[PDB]
């Protein structure tokens, strides 16, 4: 027998917006379902590693999630990774302390 | 094509109503010269030029 399928839209070309996956329907027919692109996980602003705890969706889909689902409960939330936030705390403290040490050295 | 561009679809409606034969009663009008539709168009003969 034959199991070939057809596009369900008038775009006949193998473009990025014309991606399909084959399913089998309850009626016993092989059909195609047009699927959107898969989302990309948000990256860290400093190092660029995939941020844990936040889902990977298309940009418009993030408007549908609740606030806790789009971020972690740390300082820089779902924007910077934990290792980069830890470095920022140490950098801010150490450099500020060195500025004080440099200060008191200047007047004396 | 199936994508019609409404302005174009409006011209195609005009072209098929114009492609009719002449009513019989016109051929009897006491001074008539009209005998047959001399502006008949067929899709296999002449292009609409749209």
């Amino acid at each position: 027998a034959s199991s070939r399928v057809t596009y369900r839209r008038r775009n006949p070309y193998n473009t990025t917006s014309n991606k399909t996956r084959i399913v089998k329907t309850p009626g016993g027919q092989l059909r195609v379902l047009h699927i959107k692109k898969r989302g990309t996980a948000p990256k860290c602003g400093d190092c660029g590693i995939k941020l844990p705890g936040v889902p990977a969706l298309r940009p418009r889909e993030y408007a549908q999630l609740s606030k806790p689902k789009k971020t972690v409960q740390r300082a820089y939330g779902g924007s910077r990774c934990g290792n980069c936030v830890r470095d920022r705390v140490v950098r801010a403290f150490l450099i500020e302390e060195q500025k004080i040490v440099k200060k008191v050295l200047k007047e004396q | 094509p199936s994508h019609k561009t409404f302005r174009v679809k409006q011209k195609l409606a005009k072209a098929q109503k114009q492609n009719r034969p002449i009513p019989q009663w016109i051929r009897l009008r006491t001074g008539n010269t009209i005998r047959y539709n001399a502006k008949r168009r067929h899709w296999r003969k002449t292009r609409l030029g749209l």
Partner: protein, 88 residues
Amino acid sequence: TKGTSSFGKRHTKTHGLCRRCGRRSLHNQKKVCASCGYPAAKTRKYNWSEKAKRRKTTGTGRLRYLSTVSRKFKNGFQTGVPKGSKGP
């Protein structure tokens, strides 16, 4: 292969319909009519083609308004009603 073979590759429709003159002469890339020259205010016509002006001149259409001007002048541009017409 510049003949019968090359005519098969011809499905591109350089010229489209024009809003001003209704001819299929509006260049699609230049957006300029080849007959009436319509990106512009002034209708295109030249004295080196007497036939082209003749096809486009004033007597070739309905004359929706000029046909009545001749009658208005002959009566001297009257106003009002003919001396006691019915109804105000």
